């Protein structure tokens, strides 16, 4: 009993007069918990399937006739309630059970041929079967996400703060359309853009990288009179936090200065895109020009380095200027790629609008058996709830360019509910297929870059997520342990386990010791369950049973009432 000393031994003697439990199978604890998680993920995956199979149908027969005006949806249901999963369900219709909430982008207006037309067929069947999915508690937050408006099942109330929140932008949805992405930006810093469109473009990259997937490699190829890169030269995997921040703040200083080499930037663009030496993460291979307007075709380099057309071009003319869209509009179409503009601060929705869907083309095609659920990295809910993983799936149109991406919220709280904490008293930890776990080694805040107290003078844009983390940084480095995370990150090894004698951080001063610990890959989708253990043994005393004298000790608890 540690410091409790010899007087405590009598309790063990009383325990000698009593009962225990021991147990703690370690290995089997891992196998079981992993499999259990597999069971949850299976239930909710199968549940997810239903929206595919069903939303495909109604959309196929939605008629999509205009007219409208009459009865859709409409009004505003309002039935108060309060229960588990927090939040008092009550009133929810910008346009448990009881009807369904239907969020809209605050800029998008509930007054269009498109909007209501969706609004019909979506809820018109979704409500039913999602409710059927409520027949099997407890779906924590079933959520539909379309091109615009949310469908939240059950009436959690949306929402002087401004709701700048969208859905096209919000990452789980980004995961649901075309993955992964090899990205190579070319800002045109050419002594040509003013400081105006420079500010705009600066903001543009500044947000787009946030818009960009948080597991896709990226550079920033500034060019004019010469090509050049912001320092890194490898790119990136992205800690999102640190890496993207570096690149971003580097963007923060990007003065225009110099004539347009144009081709030379491209010359490195394909090349820096080319490479082969490590990382890279092979897949779609695309570059993004943000520029005032090109003065030439560059087909020469194109044929020089592309014909497999694995290269893509997304060109984003911005602001006003006056330069012809021609050579640019020639280019993206020339090379598979979808050009489109950002005139002012329409930057948010325009960024998402075809940054993903144009990459959705292959998925629309042969992709269909690919509609396996695509789980996300941990992040905080838009509504207060605490951090929650969200499994997504795509849903197809009928002949067109893809419909919309359904998902399920999964409280990491109940993810922990499958994570027993009683046979032991130190830590679980569950690293993702790359960065992060959900390990009880940390709490609930959005990481953050480095420092910077904001200048109070200008201030009279609120949380962005995900909480990305190194396994390596979540907990103390040991090289050997680094071998271990680099082993598990591939996911290859199964029951492989061993102690590493190691100092361990606690509150604010470190201990040291051995920690034999179990872990396995999930048999299903990636990940890896894990169980760090104070090599103290592997047992957990308990007690059973009967009232009687134990009821008398319960009466001692009755004495403990006061």
């Amino acid at each position: 009993x540690x410091x409790x000393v010899h007087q405590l031994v009598d309790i063990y003697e009383k325990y000698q007069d009593l009962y225990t439990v021991e147990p703690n199978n370690a290995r089997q604890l891992v196998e079981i918990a992993a499999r259990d998680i597999e069971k949850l993920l299976s239930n909710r995956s199968k549940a997810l399937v239903r929206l595919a199979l069903e939303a495909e149908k109604v959309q196929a027969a939605h008629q999509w006739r205009e007219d409208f005006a009459s009865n859709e949806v409409v009004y505003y249901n309002a039935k108060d309630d309060l229960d588990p999963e927090k939040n008092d369900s009550e009133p929810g219709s910008q346009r448990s059970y009881q009807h369904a909430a239907v969020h809209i982008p605050t800029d998008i207006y509930e007054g269009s041929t498109i909007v209501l037309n969706e609004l019909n067929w979506t809820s018109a069947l979704d409500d039913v079967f999602k409710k059927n999915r409520e027949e099997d508690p407890s779906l924590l937050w079933q959520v539909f996400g379309s091109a615009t408006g949310l469908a939240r099942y059950y009436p959690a109330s949306p929402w002087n703060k401004i709701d700048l929140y969208d859905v096209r932008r919000r990452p789980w949805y980004i995961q649901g359309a075309a993955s992964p992405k090899d990205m190579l930006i070319l800002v045109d810093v050419s002594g040509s853009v003013s400081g105006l469109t420079l500010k705009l473009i600066r903001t543009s990259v500044s947000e787009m990288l946030e818009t960009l997937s948080d597991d896709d490699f990226v550079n920033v190829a500034s060019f004019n009179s010469n090509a050049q890169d912001v320092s890194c030269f490898q790119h990136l995997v992205q800690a999102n936090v640190r890496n993207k921040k570096v690149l971003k703040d580097a963007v923060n200083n990007i003065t225009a200065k110099g004539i347009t080499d144009y081709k030379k930037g491209f010359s490195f663009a394909f090349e820096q895109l080319l490479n082969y030496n490590v990382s890279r993460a092979n897949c779609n291979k695309i570059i993004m020009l943000f520029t005032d307007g090109g003065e030439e075709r560059a087909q020469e380099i194109f044929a020089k380095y592309n014909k497999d057309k694995k290269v893509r071009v997304f060109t984003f003319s911005v602001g006003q200027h006056n330069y012809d869209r021609g050579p640019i509009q020639w280019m993206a179409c020339e090379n598979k790629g979808y050009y489109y503009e950002i005139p002012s601060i329409g930057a948010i929705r325009i960024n998402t609008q075809e940054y993903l869907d144009v990459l959705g083309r292959p998925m629309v095609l042969a992709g269909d058996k690919a509609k396996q659920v695509q789980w996300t990295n941990v992040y905080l809910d838009a509504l207060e709830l605490g951090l929650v993983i969200t499994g997504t799936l795509p849903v197809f149109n009928i002949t067109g360019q893809f419909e919309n991406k359904t998902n399920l919220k999964n409280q990491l709280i109940l993810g922990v509910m499958g994570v027993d904490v009683s046979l032991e008293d130190i830590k679980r930890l569950t690293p993702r297929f790359t960065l992060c776990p959900n390990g009880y080694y940390f709490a609930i805040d959005p990481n953050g870059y480095v420092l910077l107290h904001p200048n109070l003078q200008p201030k009279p844009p609120k949380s962005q997520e995900p909480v990305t983390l190194d396994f390596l940084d979540a907990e103390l480095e040991n090289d050997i342990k680094v071998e271990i995370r680099n082993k598990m990150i591939d996911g290859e090894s199964g029951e492989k386990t061993f102690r590493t004698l190691v100092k361990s951080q606690d509150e604010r001063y470190i201990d040291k010791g051995n920690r034999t610990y179990t872990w396995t890959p999930v048999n299903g989708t990636d990940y890896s369950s894990l169980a760090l253990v104070l090599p103290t043994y592997s047992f957990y005393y308990i007690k059973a049973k009967i009232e009687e004298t134990i009821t008398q000790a319960r009466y001692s608890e009755t004495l403990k009432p006061d």
């Binding site: 509009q329 050009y339 990150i489 001063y509």
Partner: protein
């Protein structure tokens, strides 16, 4: 300070150990702890890279009908 000089000799004879925490009040605070107190935050960037990434799935990109819809 001078006590930290005696401590410096104590180090010559314990465990100076930087230990970043990305959490805390937003900022990425470093924490020395010995086997004096939490300060601000800095540094990373790196030159040498490590920690192998992985995927090896889907990555659909091959096509047979990229319609030249372009824009507009």
């Amino acid at each position: 300070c001078i006590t930290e000089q005696t401590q410096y000799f104590f180090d010559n004879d314990d465990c100076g150990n930087c230990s970043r925490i990305f959490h805390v009040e937003k900022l990425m605070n470093t924490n020395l702890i010995f086997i004096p107190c939490d300060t601000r935050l800095l540094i990373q960037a790196e030159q040498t890279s490590d920690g192998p990434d992985p995927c090896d799935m889907v990555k659909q990109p091959r096509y047979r009908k990229g319609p030249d819809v372009c824009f507009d």
